[PDB]
From a paper:
The viral main protease, known as Mpro, or 3CLpro, plays an essential role in the polyprotein processing of viral replication. Each monomer comprises a catalytic domain (β-barrel fold, including domains I and II) and an α-helical domain (domain III), where the two domains are connected by a long loop region. The catalytic dyad (H41 and C145) is located in the cleft between domain I and domain II of the β-barrel fold. Dimerization has been found to be necessary for the enzyme to maintain an enzymatically active conformation.
The crystal structure of Mpro in complex with NB1A2 shows that the epitope of NB1A2 overlaps with the substrate binding site and catalytic site. The catalytic domain and helix domain contact each other, representing the compact conformation of monomeric Mpro compared with the above extended conformation, and the whole architecture is similar to that of one promoter of dimeric Mpro. However, the α-helical domain displaces from the catalytic domain about 2 Å. The structure reveals that NB1A2 employs its CDR3, inserting into the cleft of the substrate binding site and the catalytic site as a competitive inhibitor. The sidechain of R124 on CDR3 forms hydrophilic interactions with the catalytic site residue H41 and the two residues C44 and S46 from the substrate binding pocket. A hydrogen bond is formed between the carboxy group of T131 on CDR3 and the sidechain hydroxy group of S46 from helix A. Q189 from the loop connecting domains II and III interacts with residues T120, Y121, and L122 of CDR3 through four different hydrogen bonds. These interactions can block the substrate binding. The N-terminal finger in the compact monomer shows that it swings about 21.5° relative to that of active dimer and the orientation of the sidechain of M6 and R4 changes greatly. However, these interactions are lost in the monomer, and the constraints to the C terminal are released; indeed, the density of the residues of the C terminal is not observed in the monomer. The superposition of the NB1A2 binding monomer and one protomer of dimeric Mpro shows that the NB1A2 has a steric clash with the B helix, D helix, and C terminal of another protomer of dimeric Mpro. Therefore, NB1A2 also acts as an allosteric inhibitor of the enzyme.
Residue numbers in the entry:
A (entry chain D): 24 to 146
B (entry chain E): 1 to 219, 224 to 300
Write the structure that this text describes.
Amino acid sequence: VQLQESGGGSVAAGGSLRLSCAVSGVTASSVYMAWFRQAPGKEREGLAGINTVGYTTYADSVKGRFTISKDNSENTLYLQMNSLKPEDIALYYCAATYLLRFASLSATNFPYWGQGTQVTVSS
Amino acid sequence: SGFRKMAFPSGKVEGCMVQVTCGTTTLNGLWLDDVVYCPRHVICTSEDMLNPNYEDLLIRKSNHNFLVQAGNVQLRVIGHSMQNCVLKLKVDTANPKTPKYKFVRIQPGQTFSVLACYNGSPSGVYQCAMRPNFTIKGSFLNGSCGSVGFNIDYDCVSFCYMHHMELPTGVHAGTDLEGNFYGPFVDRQTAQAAGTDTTITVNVLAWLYAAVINGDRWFTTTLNDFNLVAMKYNYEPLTQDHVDILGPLSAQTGIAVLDMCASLKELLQNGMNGRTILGSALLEDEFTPFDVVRQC
């Protein structure tokens, strides 16, 4: 499993970004996938996850603003990020797993991680 | 007509549910006498299960690495051993609420109640069937790792199932209480898709008998000729032991089992006809013959 994030950047409050996570080494259709962020000095926070039959889970912190989606033909995971706020500043990480033992958005579920992409929001 | 799924009263199992923590992993355990049973992957982070050597991983753990919480009480772990994929933590205290119990391994099509728990805390009880592909579908086991399945017969609790993991499709896999997986699944981070699920034929016939007992009566004499038809509609084979199991229901309704099989023959071909059977338009296959006589 190989995960590579892109699409981070700098926006002003209220702005928007679309993150991408390119999956290599395995099919994206074979793993549960999720988006996490690591705010400065904070533990990794699960934001949105999707299982391989399309069932999505969202953290309350991003409901209504962020949308997770998956293009199996491109083997790529997406996070549409609307209505960004300074509270959203973090490195954003793609993650995948073959097996869940905990609540879906818990980082303890995931052994595969990208290296993160930076999101900054000016106020 | 009021024919309902029954869960077993879960109190005898609730009194046995504990929380087991090893490092960053917390999950449910089952406390019987002075032993706590739980999935052996309690000793693993998810990265540990990429290529786990469980014997080597367990050597690196001591009794003090296991934290067992029974409600407001921490139970001291005084021994640990692996049995297949189940970990057995000997504790310094025998559970005073231990019921009469035994460990059984069940077959696809047999039913059992699952007490879904979150970190030792009972959440709900669900009547489930073992699917032919050995999986359980539904979100109720998400975040309920280590919850157990059971039957109760004259206040004896037969434990038959322990949940280990949710697959990427959302279906769940587990073991018996001796730690052998149901179906071809592994407690390792690897692809392991479940096989094609089939319909439990003997249970559909039991449900049709239940449909005759409550007044629904609009309905291949030899077992072998019926199986020739059933194997073509993605139904499980009907063994001679299955016809034996349907005897009690056959005597009560006076309907010969092979006559009931003959009735199932044409239901699969024609269709729904817009009509209902026991308040359902689809054939139901999660009631065993025992479950039907239990209710009727």
